[PDB]
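Handout, section 4.2: multi-component inputs.
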Amino acid sequence: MDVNPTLLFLKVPAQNAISTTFPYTGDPPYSGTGYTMDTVNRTHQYSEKGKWTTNTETGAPQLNPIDGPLPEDNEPSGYAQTDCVLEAMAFLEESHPGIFENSCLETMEVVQQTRVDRLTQGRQTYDWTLNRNQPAATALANTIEVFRSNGLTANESGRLIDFLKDVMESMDKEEMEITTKQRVNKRSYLIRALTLNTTPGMQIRGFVYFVETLARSICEKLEQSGLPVGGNEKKAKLANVVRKMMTNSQDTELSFTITGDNTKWNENQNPRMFLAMITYITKNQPEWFRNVLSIAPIMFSNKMARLGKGYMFESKSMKLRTQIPAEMLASIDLKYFNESTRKKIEKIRPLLIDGTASLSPGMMMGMFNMLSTVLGVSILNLGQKRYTKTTYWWDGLQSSDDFALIVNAPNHEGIQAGVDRFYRTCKLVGINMSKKKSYINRTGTFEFTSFFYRYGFVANFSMELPSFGVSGINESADMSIGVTVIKNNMINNDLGPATAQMALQLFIKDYRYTYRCHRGDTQIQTRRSFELKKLWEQTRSKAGLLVSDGGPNLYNIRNLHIPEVCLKWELMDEDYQGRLCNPLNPFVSHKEIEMEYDAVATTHSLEDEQMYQKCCNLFEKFFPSSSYRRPVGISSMVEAMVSRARIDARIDFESGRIKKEEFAEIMKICSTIEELRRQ
Amino acid sequence: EITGTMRRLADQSLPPNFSCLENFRAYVDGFEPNGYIEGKLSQMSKEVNAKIEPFLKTTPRPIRLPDGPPCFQRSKFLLMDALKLSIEDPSHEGEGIPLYDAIKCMRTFFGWKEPYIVKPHEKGINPNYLLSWKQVLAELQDIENEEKIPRTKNMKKTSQLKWALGENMAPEKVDFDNCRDVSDLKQDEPELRSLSSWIQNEFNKACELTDSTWIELDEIGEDVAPIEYIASMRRNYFTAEVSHCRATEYIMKGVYINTALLNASCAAMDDFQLIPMISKCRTKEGRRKTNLYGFIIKGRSHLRNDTDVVNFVSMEFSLTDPRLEPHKWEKYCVLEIGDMLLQMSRPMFLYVRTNGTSKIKMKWGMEMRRCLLQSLQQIESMIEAESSVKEKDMTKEFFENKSETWPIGESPKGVEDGSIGKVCRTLLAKSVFNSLYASPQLEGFSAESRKLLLVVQALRDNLEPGTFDLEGLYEAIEECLINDPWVLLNASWFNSFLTHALR
Amino acid sequence: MEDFVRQCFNPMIVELAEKAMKEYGEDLKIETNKFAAICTHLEVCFMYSDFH
Amino acid sequence: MERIKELRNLMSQSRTREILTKTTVDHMAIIKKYTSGRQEKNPSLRMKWMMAMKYPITADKRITEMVPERNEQGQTLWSKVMVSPLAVTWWNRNGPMTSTVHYPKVYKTYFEKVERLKHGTFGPVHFRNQVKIRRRVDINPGHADLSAKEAQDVIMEVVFPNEVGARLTITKEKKEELQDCKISPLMVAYMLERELVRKTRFLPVAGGTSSVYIEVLHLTQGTCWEQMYTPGGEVRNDDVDQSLIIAARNIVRRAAVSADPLASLLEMCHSTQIGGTRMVDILRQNPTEEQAVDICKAAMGLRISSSFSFGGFTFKRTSGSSIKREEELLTGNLQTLKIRVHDGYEEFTMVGKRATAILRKATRRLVQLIVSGRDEQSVAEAIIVAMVFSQEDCMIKAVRGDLNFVNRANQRLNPMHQLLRHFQKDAKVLFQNWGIEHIDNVMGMIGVLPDMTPSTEMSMRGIRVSKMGVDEYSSTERVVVSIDRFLRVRDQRGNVLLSPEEVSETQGTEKLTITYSSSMMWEINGPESVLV
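Output:
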């Protein structure tokens, strides 16, 4: 006989065993420089309505398809009317009294209080200083130093808004010189400030963070928005909203639920529409607030897309290969390419400038997810049977692209009318609904961002099971971290108790293998097992020994929150406790701590990137409290440290014991540095 | 402030109805919801609609399958055809040096015939493979001259080995300034391969039980709570039904192989090191056994990035004639290398292939025991979701009750339901095959077929479902079906399911 | 900022600053720093005039 | 001298001295976050490769005179300062046994968990389709209700006294018991910050309110099950706010009777002391949301939650607006009443003592209502206050008798509170006069009859009593209040937010010692306290 796993769906419903369809646990091997051109040409495909305007400061032609011609065919179109978006915003604000003003006040508090720290906490970014992708902190330091080398030194006040002011005044300077040194002119600098990678630039990140904070403050006060919440919270927002629909009295209700998704949702959102909806949200607000929040949409309206590495040609006869970058696409003939490459290059030749293509109506994935969710919640709010003025009425939950709708109408004839109205209004605001990856049924069974509802719940949303392997930082820290991660995934990203048991089992196996500490009970011997077996032989109560010292495991579900030392503490030997918990050991030092737990004897271990770190470490060496709490003080680093040094020298010379000449030399060096800081 | 070169971009970002953005902001400030939505709807064409097309049991048509040349096997190592070479030796593990364990595997076999090669690669230098194998045997027997055993055999930079790893100098790196013009300076979509019969047999063998245990699952503390009792009774029954399965051997094999290769790709960054394919298990009588599936020769491993690829040659033992199914071994070259004592004395073959792997490809395969956890959760969900409607949950009726049978097979044109252990091993082997046969086609197929499955379920619950463009869904499904045997087997499975779902 | 000022000052200075900001239509939701400065000035004046 | 020498040779390079001279201390936090960020080279794999390597540990130089080079089998564990991991096990085997078993005073917060597990008697597992109840609970045992700033200001004093800020019983107790037995200042500081700082967050629970129930939430609650668990022995801060609640209730009750209630409330607040700390400071820094506590906070100028209180139930606006449109109405017993008729459509979520609900109400017409409570009389009270707020003429005509309800200060109540306090005691007329309709019992929704009996196909007009609880969404909002001289708080828009007339639903035990020292309160603590 032949074995077929999917046949199991014949006895068990789909939602009860849907986790069998998800093949991968984590991320599989994936796989460009041409793929960018495909997306660029597709974005300009849904926007070809003669709205070309040649840019004045970048010289790149720009499509402006907003409020253009209406769509005649069912194919996806990116032509959204401005007054429609503004009316959706107005009706959203009418349904929810003054939500925009509260969100705007919260965002004003954010922009007033935000330091430059929030700009370093991020993933890979695009450094224009080196024209390459770099980590967040390194790209930030590169931009800071290249600004400080020129006449741009406003960021040293600590405010992110001052860094944004520096970014503003940078585009006004005619030439920007980069030291490593060579000059760059204003045009190419504008190109580099408004160019993205396959990854935002360094300048746009502050404005995009502020816009995202505003969208977050808006989405927090919306039942129909499911982006800010995650996990069990989402569960409620499903079981609640369905109960607002299915539980209607006098059953004259026909409630149909659609599981939806918007195909090519990302490439149709025009940043000018975002500018419009922000301008309406910042209505009657102070002018500086609008001037700050509106920067990101303007930068996205005039933005370039970096192509990347390039292509590579191979000679079948001469046996020689050559690479061609993206910058050389202008001065080249079209004989060396196959038919598909030529077909893609022809439609993008007049768009590219300085090795980067021009993309006016574009928007990149994962940039304005929450503001896009606000836009979707607008149309979701337009179905309160008061703005439809008809018998059909809908409501639902919105995410970035995956949305779940529930529409009620008095008879089977009116449901399609409501669905068609919803779809056409989505087309009006630039939301192209996917007729392929969507389906309808009766209320009681649907999907929303991998959350499946069939008269019950299953949370296969973030069920990328945790790293069963060791975290690899330390002996006790790794065990505490692994068991705390298992405990967290048992409440946040719901998994069964037996799965958690087996996960702890695999983790303990990987932890005993990683640190060559299995136990003193097994015959297996690593480099370390002799000492472990000597321990096990001399220890009376074997259970008290830690797993890091070759001890037995007694962690289970009930005690995943207790650190290993405290759990086995009662069962330890007095000798073993004294030899383990001794703080006067030559093994540990107060470094790189932290949600981590107890620490014991098994707690062991631009110009130059560490320009800052040296200074910070020395300052911490002068004031230990700075390693715990953000320091407060108006004096400069040098004077504060010198005063600390002088006082410490005085106290450990007068009452303590230190050499008189050593004290003299210390204070001589201190006065030398005091004189040094005069220049 | 918004000064020039910034205000200039602001004025060029507004809709094509204004010149200064101040006019736009004043227009937005005073706005009148006079019902522009209804006007724009009255103006829009009536073709723009989400016309619901009903979904009854007649509309589902079985998934189309590609036709063409038979699909070959591209798994990194032999799954059912590989042959073990036991030493039943307690050297007790881990720090144990794997090179001498492999040579004492070789010490236990006799009957090494002169290599008479059988199935060629059909494109490439075939005798170089048997020359490389002879070099392997020679370098193995040539340790007694070294006077110091090396812990790692670094193969000579021989011509056959430079070719088998593709290190022979390729097109040289030049610039376009001097290769501006050559007559042939050109720069490819895959071919459509049809499903073959061997992948189903591979899966069937993957669900079978074996002789050994293949797991060392560590301990868990005392159970002093009812949910702890339930979790233990689930996990230990699963471990008992899954441990001796062949898919567990596959998991451990992949883990050991990828671990050895990645560990060698750090210290052997310059020379061709011989990497043995060693696994370890425990026989039925409770004695630890060390198995050798074959050898692997690694190329240059300057793995700076994670996607950087190192080439290798896998030479694996087998007892299957390639002449039985030659279409399966497209990327394989076969060497009939001996006869072994079985007393049938069947011929022992060596399947040698050249392949390439990256750091991420290796690490996705060192964590293959996730295939266990996934299975457990996809079991545990069914124990909870299907049994959430109960006061005292159904947990001991799921197991311990052989009357409950689940559909897993169709031999006689009819459903052949099996027991619980077959279900556990089927899900385990499915997850494992997804791990090693991982391909983006499989991901796309899962994503697109899950929707069709959910709508089939909504119809089966009599919830009057309907679609918009079923042809679009079918196009998306047919788009990710080209040449992968695993994806095509899953497609045939879904076709069987749709055939046996009253449709 | 706006909430913090209500902590480090007594309710009387807060009330007086709120009355004083209603002189020139100064909305305290925006001019938070002006509110803080006015509260500071009032408390300085009060601690200046007392006990003499 | 090594540090000042590093300052010297560091202040030499221009680009390394400009940073040290220009940047002040206040901004040091923003200058530490400038890293290379090369760290994530698969740290599990790196740790395995480093453990496979000989002598990967780093120690100081004092190991040379403390542990041997060769162990009892001749195995090396040194280098030249790298260390083999076997040396750690050696040090744990026969090393310096010391008297620092004193440990469980800094790590008290973990031994507390261990003790709660020791006597944590268990219970059965009643499987059910668990529905998440969105509560806001604290996750810290025994922290004395100290915020992050005022707790770190104590940490700095007890562990780094020579560099304290420019600014209390715990500050003495901890400084005393770990005076000279310090372990590691950063470790002690982190542990005391975990032990002493409060933290309240928005979590979905299914029966756990106290700190002891949330710390073990993964045991009790899961996907579709629940485990009855009792640790034994509560914590300090789940009943610290209760005494402040009782004090605020008594203060408001005594102020409402006074001539000028607002000034009385202010003086009593600034003079009352709760557990050694003055009341107004707690009010300024406490996240407890109660009606009398909001009255007290509004009397001194602090922000409260937009939620308005009616019938002891706090309301939250979900969607919809309204217009005032005052209107006159005649009762069912010939009584003229001028009323503020809530016009338009509105959606509300009302949280109560032991019952919550979701209401959808149009102009003088109740559209939909979903209620869930614990007691039968409690859901009855919820339904009564909801019917009173519904403003339908059905309950106006159901008024039986003249409405003359006065406050404890002999004050004419608003017509809303008149109807409420009338229907609150005897309401069986309104039920039999409201109306019955058919339901379908879907999504676990049952109906209620006039005799307070559940039914599967019959309910009141537009009503549903929900099983497995109503989802309680408690969103945080902070808007300035407009307190008046009679202790009534209104929004900036002009909507009466809260008033004293609904505060007293229980007496008060004051689980912690409370002290009133103003003038008017020296009669609650018996006549014997008057003299003292």
